[PDB]
Symmetry: C2
């Protein structure tokens, strides 16, 4: 039943974070954590495909997308498995991460264990933007920090 | 059906390396790559239980051990799943890693995805040392470098 994971976000910039995941059986994945050093406002937050850090955050590849879907927010039927939407930083440069997601898992085909969590320079437009980029990355821009999602005690 | 993984080993010291894993179906896992900055001689080399980098290599926990066995060498029946024995650095402090193992996996219960690869200060005595510590860690001593094992393209 009860699975736990951890991710240590690190980057070249001053963005740092610790994210925790817990899933009780078939229950949803509850994500809890903080990110620091952010500019005030919304920042895209996704699970990328590869847990590969040979090229900082570049080697993480694209949004985890085992179904061949277009980019969305967490609530839209049309979304990447990895689409966790946005986290909001305050004027202190800190976001509280508090997400409940049924599509991600810590086991089975949708498991995010050994994939890369990424927080982005800019707001994820949740795939509602006009241009092509919205259907792909939600125009969240740069990868500020990432880590491999690890199994936790 | 082919699965690939990668681990970037990082420490507080001169030891670093990139390790590659490949598993064809339920076959052996082939481990390759290079570690630099090591003292000449044999170094303990294991998969530890947790992919938790919240306290450097310490939060990785003990050897991966889902069958609840004592420590051994990779050829021993009595071994932890994570027991990959020793890598050997030459005069120049380079270890060429070339291992095939039948207990670790890149999927299912023996999966090392989201766990931590550790290279040690000292030789692993392969559980033959005749103190309790041999039966836990092989007297491999401190953790020179580690990384979370991530899904790779
Ligand atoms: Cu992203
Ligand atoms: Cu070890
Ligand atoms: Zn997406
Ligand atoms: Zn062991």
């Amino acid at each position: 039943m009860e699975m736990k994971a951890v991710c240590v976000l690190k980057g070249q910039g001053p963005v740092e974070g610790t994210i925790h995941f817990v899933q009780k059986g078939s229950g949803p994945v509850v994500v809890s954590g903080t990110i620091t050093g952010l500019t005030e406002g919304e920042h895209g937050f996704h699970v990328h495909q590869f847990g590969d850090n040979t090229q900082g955050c570049t080697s993480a590849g694209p949004h985890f997308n085992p179904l061949s879907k277009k980019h969305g927010g967490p609530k839209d039927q049309e979304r990447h498995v990895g689409d966790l939407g946005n986290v909001t930083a305050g004027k202190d440069g800190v976001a509280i991460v508090s997400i409940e997601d049924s599509l991600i898992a810590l086991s089975g085909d949708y498991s995010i264990i050994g994939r890369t969590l990424v927080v982005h320079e800019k707001r994820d437009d949740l795939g509602k933007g006009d241009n092509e980029e919205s259907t792909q990355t939600g125009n969240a821009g740069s990868r500020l920090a990432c880590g491999v999602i690890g199994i936790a005690q």
